[PDB]
Amino acid sequence: MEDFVRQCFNPMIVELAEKAMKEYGEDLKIETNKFAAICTHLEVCFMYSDFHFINERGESIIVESGDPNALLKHRFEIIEGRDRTMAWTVVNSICNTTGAEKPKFLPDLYDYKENRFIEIGVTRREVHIYYLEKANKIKSEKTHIHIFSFTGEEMATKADYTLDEESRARIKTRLFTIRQEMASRGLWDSFRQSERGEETIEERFEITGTMRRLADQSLPPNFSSLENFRAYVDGFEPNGYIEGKLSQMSKEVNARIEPFLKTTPRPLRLPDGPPCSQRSKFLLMDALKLSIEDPSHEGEGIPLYDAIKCMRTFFGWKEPNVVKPHEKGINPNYLLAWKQVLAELQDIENEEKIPKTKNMKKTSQLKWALGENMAPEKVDFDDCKDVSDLKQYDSDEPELRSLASWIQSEFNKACELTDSSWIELDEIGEDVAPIEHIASMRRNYFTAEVSHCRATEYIMKGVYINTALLNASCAAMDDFQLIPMISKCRTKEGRRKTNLYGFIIKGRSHLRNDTDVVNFVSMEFSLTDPRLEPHKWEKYCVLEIGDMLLRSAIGQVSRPMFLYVRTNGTSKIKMKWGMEMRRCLLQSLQQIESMIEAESSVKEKDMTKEFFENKSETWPIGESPKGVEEGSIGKVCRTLLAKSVFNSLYASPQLEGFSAESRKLLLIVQALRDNLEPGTFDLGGLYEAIEECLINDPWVLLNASWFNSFLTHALR
Amino acid sequence: MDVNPTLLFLKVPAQNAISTTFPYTGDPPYSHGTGTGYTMDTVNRTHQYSEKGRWTTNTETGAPQLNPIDGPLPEDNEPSGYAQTDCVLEAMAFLEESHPGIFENSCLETMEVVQQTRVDKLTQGRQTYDWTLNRNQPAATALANTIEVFRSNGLTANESGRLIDFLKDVMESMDKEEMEITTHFKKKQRLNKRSYLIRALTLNTMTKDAERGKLKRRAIATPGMQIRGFVYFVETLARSICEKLEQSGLPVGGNEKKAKLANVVRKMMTNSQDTELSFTITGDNTKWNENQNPRMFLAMITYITRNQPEWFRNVLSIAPIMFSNKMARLGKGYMFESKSMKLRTQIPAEMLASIDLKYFNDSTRKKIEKIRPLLIDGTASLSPGMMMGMFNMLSTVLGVSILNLGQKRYTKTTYWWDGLQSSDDFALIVNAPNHEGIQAGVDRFYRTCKLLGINMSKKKSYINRTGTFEFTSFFYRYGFVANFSMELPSFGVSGINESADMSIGVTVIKNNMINNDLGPATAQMALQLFIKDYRYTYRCHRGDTQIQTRRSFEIKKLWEQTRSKAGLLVSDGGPNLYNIRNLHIPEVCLKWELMDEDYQGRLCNPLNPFVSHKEIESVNNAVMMPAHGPAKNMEYDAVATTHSWIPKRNRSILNTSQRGILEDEQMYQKCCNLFEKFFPSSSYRRPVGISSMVEAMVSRARIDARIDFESGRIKKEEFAEIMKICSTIEELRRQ
Amino acid sequence: VQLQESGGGLVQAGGSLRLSCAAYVMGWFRQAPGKEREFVAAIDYADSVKGRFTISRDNAKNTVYLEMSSLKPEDTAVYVCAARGQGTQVTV
Amino acid sequence: MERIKELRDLMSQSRTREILTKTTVDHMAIIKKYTSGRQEKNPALRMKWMMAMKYPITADKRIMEMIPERNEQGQTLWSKTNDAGSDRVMVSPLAVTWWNRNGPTTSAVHYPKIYKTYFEKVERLKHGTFGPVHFRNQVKIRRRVDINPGHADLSAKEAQDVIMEVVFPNEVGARILTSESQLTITKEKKEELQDCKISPLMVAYMLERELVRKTRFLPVAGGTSSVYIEVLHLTQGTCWEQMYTPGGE
RNA sequence: GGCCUGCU
RNA sequence: AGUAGAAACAAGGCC
């Protein structure tokens, strides 16, 4: 039958009908009479629509061939011959522009004169039944319907026929051409009734070929095919198989509970080796401040001018000389770098306006100090294979180092009060609710407690230094840059003040990965002689740069004044995390506020004021040789803030591992102290897990010592 | 006196101050170089936990595979992957018996979803291993490349737009003699059957960064695109199953997890009378993923899909069949340094099979020597067990089956147990009349776990009396206690854009106040610090200050120009009006009545060249990877302002041989923008159909010109011009 | 579509002949004994036959006609109808 | 006119012509998401790192013809170098602030009508009345509650057709909404937003947010009302309760 | 010396 | 040298 559509109809219509065939997903080889019927429907749609044009009037202009002009409007514009999505697109667009009603089924054409749709259907059966059939299929329709049938008859409601009658003679001539051409073909044994509305399909997902063999190799050891295994599974029913293997399984497979008593836990062993060194990016306990007493705010001002003005406030400069060498570098380079920094600072002082940011010369001194041109050149393996020295990067456990007493004192003095306010908080919306007033009062109390704390000063120092370093690295990637360490505080009298700890020289910072390292050299003034705790300054070079006179009742001290100079490095991640050190304030004060709220849930009243003023209640916050010492809530605030600050400063994988594996043991010990009969399956394994995190970090070793002290004081 | 914060625990219980034990204020550990060492170590460890299995050689991939299932029962407490098929089938049968109709229903909804799912659902995924280029690429890019290759090779069933048809094409590709791929350096290369099989069965290995809570780094894996559809269907089934199990806690959030934990502890302890003792085990499973054999997941799913259409069973079984034969790419490689000659070199991992061992240290030398037998075409066969939690939900199903297997109806003894399982972590409440009963119950639970290939970490687990325990960093002590140290890293600028960062910060403060019991004063301090960091990050200072920045001049002139300066946004250098009462209001709407009409109009102008919206999914959704958890998405309330710009892209593609991808990106985006202008609903609802672009665009041009004349700007001259231009593009597409 | 031509034969030079084809667009082609197909007329006319020959059709008889006048010896050919017919011999 | 003209210009060049011809409508989404840009793992780090560069943001090409290349002192506002995989150009953040002080102005009166949810929140809070804070232990129990206070009792898919018919009336397709509540919602949001020119996508997104019901599990103590849950952070705490009555009541 | 890139 | 820690940075590539 398909030979007929090969022969007669034009290409355009046959591929339109083929795409309509693909539309609903049925195959053309099984039933083709539908293809012919609907392609004839589509053909009558065209032949009825084309050759029919309109101009600004009604009364369509009919031309056998559209002449070249702007007057190519089509009388009837076709609906079908398009995908369902576009057919409904045209339906909705016509409804929204023509203000007509939206039909629920697919029309075939639209006309302007009568401003409505045409649903053309030419069926094998006579018209006077198919018409009202499709009419009762369509609900309350104003779209006019018109149908032909092979006998040659026409019909329509309203007795309406919308265009010329010679066109309809055309239609029925086409119709009988179709008819008495099948006459030569002979199809009416099924042509009248060949489609009955079949819609059914079964989804087929068959495993075959290579993928089947893979299925045959992904079974238990004693199975040969997926078919057999699935049959076995379907036939499988529970018949007490877990019990049999449990009985047969060796009894050494057990989870015996070892009781956890007061005498069970042993102190954590600390590693032994050379004392632990300093790792901070700046001096914390041995910092010195040169000040100007200016009225500018933290960010307000220009760095270089402030630094120069602060440094001019000090008199007593001496020619620098080596006091304590780096022990691994070239100290003369550090000396020359310091003198170069001074010289270029003067050079800025001379000229017209202090630059906002200064670049330094790339001398051999800072070329060595900043580690320039030291990365091995990257080459290909095929060119370097016979080199005996060629091997992997050194990948082994870090060097072992024992704890020293300097970190303990540094933390002790990091929780001490100061003679300045190191936090100038921002603005918030004016409090409107009583709860907001309570929150503001609490916040004011904590700010009064923690602002005068060395932890806040360290927070500001780190934030400013890391912000400046990151910005300089991102801006001046190539050229070495000078950045004075600046921090602005407010005195007890209320006068604002600036403080200059020293200088940082940032080097080449072409940082691609988050782990890539930018090297800088840090110089900081101090008065602490490095000849008393040399092991804490393994990586520092310390010079003697001047003498300071601070008013004291013992005449006047006239102390020496040294310069701690070192080469340090950071990374994008480290800079970003060090510039978010202000969340240590959060951590600490959230803990304290949780304490206050928990206690106030007992007594139905806010308990902040008496906690902060009466200072009756105290918490164990340290141990003295006499015994455990307790301090007021403010001291707890400062201690927790210092702990968070040191966590942010000495952060490392060792800290995370020890924290987790020691929180586990802390929970076990707490369960013991709560009389909850705690038990363990392998306590030695937990101890070994904790002890492997303690390698060389001073902070984690101090935490381990604190944990041992807590165990000793606990378990009683 | 020496200060010691830990001594604070002598007065404050450990859980009431547990936040102090979370050093989440410093930089988390990161990996620096290759992850090849970790990948090799994981492969060797997975293969040696199942050493007593039986060896075979796949006839298709030619790789050695180790099957430990039904192997000898363990005789020691060391990790073992010798799961027994009959035991696990019985466990699943008991799970079904205790929850009748679970499998049949879940299979019904899964069948509905599979037969109505679309291909585009695969684009909604993070990095995936594209085999066309042998590298990780965004899910959409890899899917597009694979579809292009399939269409070039003759597999065009995916044009039906159905994920099931895409999988049919994927499987049909397995039986092809020779496929063709494209490489740029364009060159057409031919892949034989075995090479393509291994490229479709392989995984890409990387090192996990920003992982807090352990000293050593780990390795993670990413699968290809051929196997992700089957994984999607299997995980849909597993999620539908677990949603019907109250003992599971994987498909829920954190608060639901806490609620279920509280309910189970109350149920276990309350029902226990005075005579029965109760004990809670806070258990962690050692080597959870390395001991879960994909064959056992195949067994579980084929038991689940019993009495179901065979096509459903086949499509759900394809995934574990491929995992059982999965291969893993070793990784980036190894970098060597020579200090004598002062140079460095980078050898790819694919050379580990043949490269001499003189360059490697003892540990790496031994690892390579042990893993070499499993090396096939630069990748190692990893049949014995899963790599990194790809089947999280099925593992949770197995754990829930174990938990339910002790409902006192199967124990047949006075002791019994229950609890909650979330993959790699569990809380087990066991009750028994005497300590001997508790010991026997825990021993039998451990033994049954060892029969299913699941191991309990004795070093990271402990048992106490009920009332105090831990679960996924949630510490329960007669009621869950807030931590607030897990969410600390999320208190900074997110890094999306100005308005997005502001809204996300305020919303995070609000949420942590609601859930994590953040205090009022602490919340105010957090708001102040966040505002300070926000102003210092975006160079948007109050405007009345003299802080010179790269943006302080325009901000200051805008400040001096504005009359009601209280309406200026913090992004434009205005005062901050936020407070505890205003944390749930966008900044634009909070300052709407205070803005000057000129500034208000300039700010919220639709014609601004900065705002760009791509799809309904990416309107106000921000992907923030939370600390100590999987990547998560958040809805943030924000008004589309001129500050909603999107930041610069990487721009490093220009120096790579894969430079033509940018031209293809530009052309695809131009075509997509044209289509959207032709089809405005393209973004909100993704268009569907089987036609091609130009057909729809030209035909809609026809119709829209028509109707927009029937009322609108068009004129006959223009309408006819459009009609004949449509004809022109038609004849152009002809040729 | 089958086609049957009628109306060919032997004719005088300067004579007239009416071809008809009983059986869409139609035409007439011719084939002389020493050549392939030559276009005649269709329903347009070739230069060798224009003004002499007229093509017409009846769509109610289903017949295309070629009215040939002032015939030349050069018109001697088998005239085929096409929509191909078998052709009718015209000899002038 | 224009649209078909850039269509023809695209089809003029062979590569785009092939892309338009061979690519089917269904693959629309795929190729639209086809990109070499990886999703950032650490957005904060790079946002703090990119903002220190010049020209850190991106904007459409049109910015080159609305904003001058430099400001009064000569600080550059935009660059002509396009982004990696787009025709957009990289520009400095000042071009934002500049746009807010001398850029074109419009009538933003209809934004309150569009962003109905946020402005309703603001109005509800502005007329709220606070009360005394009572300090007592709060038994926070976890419950499933609806957060959206303006949901019109419609699901995502249920209101998606409404949203399309309100914004994209022609792409609705087969669906014609039956429920009369949807009829009235369509009428109201059609006549209200008849000429709003913000964007079809944002209008659709905000209509989805407003009408679609959404639910989440939260620890609550008292309240349980939609209006009382949006301020759950302000009314309920660990040991304090703040009586509050939104402006709606 | 000149120019390109900074998660590809 | 320095940062850092089971492998890396201490710029890369292209002419």
Author numbering:
A (entry chain A): 1 to 716
B (entry chain B): 1 to 185, 207 to 756
C (entry chain F): 2 to 24, 34 to 53, 61 to 100, 118 to 126
D (entry chain C): 1 to 249
From the paper:
Using cryo-EM we determined the structure of 17 polymerase-nanobody complexes at resolutions between 4.5 and 6.7 Å; this is sufficient resolution to accurately position each nanobody bound to the polymerase heterotrimer. The most populous binding site, termed site 1, is on the PA endonuclease with five nanobodies (Nb8198, Nb8199, Nb8200, Nb8203, Nb8209) that bind at an interface formed by the short helix α1 (residues 1–10) and the long helix α6 (170–185).
Central to the replication cycle of influenza viruses is the viral RNA-dependent RNA polymerase which transcribes and replicates the viral RNA genome. The influenza virus RNA-dependent RNA polymerase is a heterotrimeric multifunctional machine composed of polymerase basic 1 (PB1), polymerase basic 2 (PB2) and polymerase acidic (PA) subunits, that catalyzes both primer-independent replication (vRNA to complementary RNA (cRNA) and cRNA to vRNA synthesis) and primer-dependent transcription (vRNA to mRNA synthesis) in the nucleus of infected cells. PB1 houses the polymerase active site, whereas PB2 and PA contain, respectively, cap-binding and endonuclease domains required for transcription initiation by cap-snatching. High-resolution structures of the complete viral polymerase from a number of human, avian and bat influenza A viruses, as well as influenza B, C, and D viruses have been determined. These structures have revealed that the polymerase is a highly flexible macromolecule that can assume a variety of distinct conformations, enabling the polymerase to perform both transcription and replication that require different initiation and termination mechanisms.
